[PDB]
Design a protein around this ligand. Structure first.
Ligand SMILES: *[C@@H]1O[C@H](CO)[C@@H](O[C@@H]2O[C@H](CO)[C@@H](O[C@@H]3O[C@H](CO)[C@@H](O)[C@H](O[C@H]4O[C@H](CO)[C@@H](O)[C@H](O)[C@@H]4O[C@H]4O[C@H](CO)[C@@H](O)[C@H](O)[C@@H]4O)[C@@H]3O)[C@H](O)[C@H]2NC(C)=O)[C@H](O)[C@H]1NC(C)=O
Ligand SMILES: *[C@@H]1O[C@H](CO)[C@@H](O)[C@H](O)[C@H]1NC(C)=O
Ligand SMILES: *[C@@H]1O[C@H](CO)[C@@H](O)[C@H](O)[C@H]1NC(C)=O
Ligand SMILES: *[C@@H]1O[C@H](CO)[C@@H](O)[C@H](O)[C@H]1NC(C)=O
Lengths: 124, 388, 109
């Protein structure tokens, strides 16, 4: 599969950042889809994931300003970050967690497929 | 009363010691004991109960004839004390040929599936009253875990399968709060067939070792997150597959991402759980039939794929004695969550063409951090002295 | 991030470097660790999962281990192609999500 990100390169402060990730190959009906963000010169930060079943999870550190949705008709899924601040600028990747155990001594190939990312800048 | 959290750590397991026995078939020769199949054990915060799916008849009865069919209108979920045989005083808590009973620390929850095979009703009865109900979504023999469910913080999780028993089927995890279905999440992950899960609490969620009836002789694991309703799945990494029919230990394999396609054309309800990187598991002695039963720990069998290093092997039932569905239930200790398992010993048709009925007994072992000995605890009922 | 990594880890070509992720109990201590390689300018790529396994394609020179509440990634061979950032992801249990705490940049002089 191939995940392609698309979003506004520049977002005004306190506005809403709407990113989109388009998925090829396998359809978005069988895995969890996560958003990761990497601030410039910093490490990756997990935003949250959503599956078409309604199972959603968000990073508590975001203070609940994040919203993600799926569209199986378009085979796409979008991020709806709210009230962005100057510290919200980062490269936003969309990745896939195909499932697999997340507890105990056995894990799985989570984030096996990533996207090239989009540099979302927050300024005026 | 308070909701069970299961927040205590899982204490060390060095083996399994006998905890209970039924002797139901032996007592059936003289007593009035229900004809039962597919049992399980679930413990309320004070004491443990045994459940079964009675055929709506007793063993010394004319209606016990041809009691081999898995789904009849007269099957009922029998429930009583762990140890008391299913006598005429047993409480039939619901109508079901596929059930899942489990206690949330305040009241019992019973998921009971009955009705026609194509059109089936799953009734969710909480605190003695019917609180919810759903219908078949795939219209092909709706079923459930056939064991205990797990309730974390009052949010019980049940595994409901609907579809073919030899092909792709839709498996949904239903999150139920006080008998009301609050969420439903279809199975997601690497498991291609999930059926008859042996769920146990693994804080902060639930872990279920299910049975693959389509292609896998290795048991899938399904992790259920009661917080955000996310379901993940894989297979057992241990090379000693615990699902019969299977291939022998020399030619068996399990790479815990796909079914191994080794004699996966059938299955039996089984169990397993993780002790660190090791896996405690139980499986029948015979590779083709459900005869005998051992339990053992495979070293690095949970993390390292295709691990065949077994240790602490125990023979629960000897090779020449019939076994059946087995399952796991968790008991809250003083400071830990002990894991116990039950083994069903099936007697009657069609393996034994002497009697006309098909009943069972149960033998329950519990994990211990101390020492133990050997021995075998079979049915012990001579089929020649049983009524025809 | 919760996971802690050294800002950088360096080693001469031909030798081997070990990169360490340090986690808590509801972290690497109880869950597995996945090691991701991010080339400068591109997306991170999975290198190690389940602390030992390797995806189909990842060379055998990359190995992993877990010691209690810490994880180590060992890179034998160490050609100039391995100069990249390495991130360690563990499924946290106190937040029911993923923690990275990356930042380890590997330089091969
Ligand atoms: C699977 O289970 C679900 C849930 O139980 C089923 O869904 C129910 O299906 C029943 C049966 O179709 C349906 O009840 C009918 O509702 C109709 C209106 O919606 C009624 O008109 C109808 O009454 C007529 O049919 C009955 C036989 O079904 C007769 O006994 C009755 O006297 C009526 O017949 C007279 O009237 C008709 C029309 O005027 C006339 O043609 C006749 O000659 C006669 O004069 C039923 O009451 C429920 O409404 C459904 N409920 C839901 C929630 O869906 C589903 O059908 C099942 N499917 C399978 C395959 O098993
Ligand atoms: C038992 O059931 C079978 C089939 O239902 C029937 O043929 C038989 O007559 C019954 N009675 C006995 C004694 O087998
Ligand atoms: C159980 O749920 C309640 C909300 O009804 C919450 O306040 C409490 O912290 C939960 N307990 C847990 C998750 O252990
Ligand atoms: C075990 O399996 C192998 C391969 O399927 C077979 O050759 C052998 O006969 C079986 N039995 C024993 C005892 O090895």
């Amino acid at each position: 599969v191939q995940l392609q990100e698309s979003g506004p390169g520049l977002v005004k402060p306190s506005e809403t950042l709407s990113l989109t990730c388009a998925i090829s190959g396998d359809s978005i009906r069988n895995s969890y889809w996560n958003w990761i963000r990497q601030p410039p010169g910093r490490g990756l930060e997990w935003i949250g994931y959503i599956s078409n079943s309604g199972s959603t999870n968000y990073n508590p550190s975001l203070k609940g300003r994040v919203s993600m949705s799926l569209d199986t008709s378009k085979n796409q899924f979008s991020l709806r970050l709210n009230s962005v601040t100057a510290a919200d600028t980062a490269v936003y990747y969309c990745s896939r967690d195909k499932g697999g155990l997340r507890w105990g001594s056995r894990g799985s190939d989570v984030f096996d497929i990533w996207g090239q990312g989009t540099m979302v800048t927050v300024s005026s | 009363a308070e909701y069970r959290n299961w927040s205590k750590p899982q204490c060390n397991i060095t083996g399994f010691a006998p905890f209970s026995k039924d002797n139901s078939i032996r007592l059936s020769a003289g007593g009035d004991i229900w004809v039962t199949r597919e049992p399980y054990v679930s413990c309320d915060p004070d004491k443990c109960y045994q459940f079964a799916l009675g055929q709506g008849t007793t063993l010394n009865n004319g209606h016990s004839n041809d009691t081999v069919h898995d789904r009849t209108p007269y099957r009922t979920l029998l429930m009583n004390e762990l140890g008391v045989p299913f006598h005429l005083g047993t409480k039939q808590v619901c109508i079901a040929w596929s059930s899942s009973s489990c206690h949330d620390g305040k009241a019992w929850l019973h998921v009971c599936v009955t009705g026609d095979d194509e059109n089936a009703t799953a009734s969710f009865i909480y605190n003695g009253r019917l609180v919810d109900s759903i219908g078949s979504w795939s219209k092909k023999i709706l079923r459930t875990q056939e064991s205990e469910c797990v309730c974390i913080n009052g949010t019980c999780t049940v595994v409901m399968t609907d579809g073919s028993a030899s092909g792709k089927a839709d498996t949904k995890i239903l999150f139920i709060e006080e008998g009301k279905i609050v969420h439903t999440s279809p199975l997601s992950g690497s498991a291609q067939h999930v059926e008859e899960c042996s769920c146990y609490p693994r804080y902060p969620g639930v872990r279920c070792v299910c049975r693959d009836n389509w292609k896998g002789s290795n048991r899938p694991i399904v992790d259920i997150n009661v917080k955000d309703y996310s379901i993940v799945s894989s297979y057992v990494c241990s090379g000693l597959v615990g699902d019969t029919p299977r291939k022998n230990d020399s030619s068996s394999s399990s790479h815990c991402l796909d079914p191994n396609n080794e004699e996966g054309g059938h299955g039996v309800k089984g169990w397993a759980f993780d002790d660190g990187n090791d896996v405690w598991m139980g499986r029948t002695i015979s590779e083709k039939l459900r005869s005998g039963y051992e339990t053992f720990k495979v070293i690095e069998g949970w993390s390292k794929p295709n691990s065949k290093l077994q240790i602490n092997r125990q023979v629960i039932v000897d090779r020449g004695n019939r076994s059946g569905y087995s399952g796991i239930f968790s008991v809250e200790g003083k400071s830990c969550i002990n894991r116990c398992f039950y083994v069903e010993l099936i007697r009657g048709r069609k393996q034994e063409t002497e009697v006309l009925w098909t009943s069972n007994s149960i033998v329950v072992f519990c994990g211990t951090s101390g020492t133990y000995g050997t021995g075998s605890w079979p049915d012990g009922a001579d089929i020649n002295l049983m009524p025809i | 991030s919760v996971l802690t990594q050294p800002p950088s880890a360096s080693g001469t070509p031909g030798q081997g470097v070990t990169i360490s992720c340090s986690g808590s109990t509801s972290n690497i201590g109880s869950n597995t660790v996945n090691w991701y390689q991010q080339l400068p300018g591109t997306a991170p790529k999975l290198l190690i999962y389940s602390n030992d396994q390797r995806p189909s394609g990842v060379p055998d020179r990359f190995s992993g281990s877990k010691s209690g509440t810490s994880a180590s990634l060992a890179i034998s061979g160490l050609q100039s192609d391995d100069e990249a950032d390495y991130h360690c992801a563990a499924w946290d249990d106190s937040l029911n999500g993923w923690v990275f705490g990356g930042g380890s940049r590997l330089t091969v002089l």
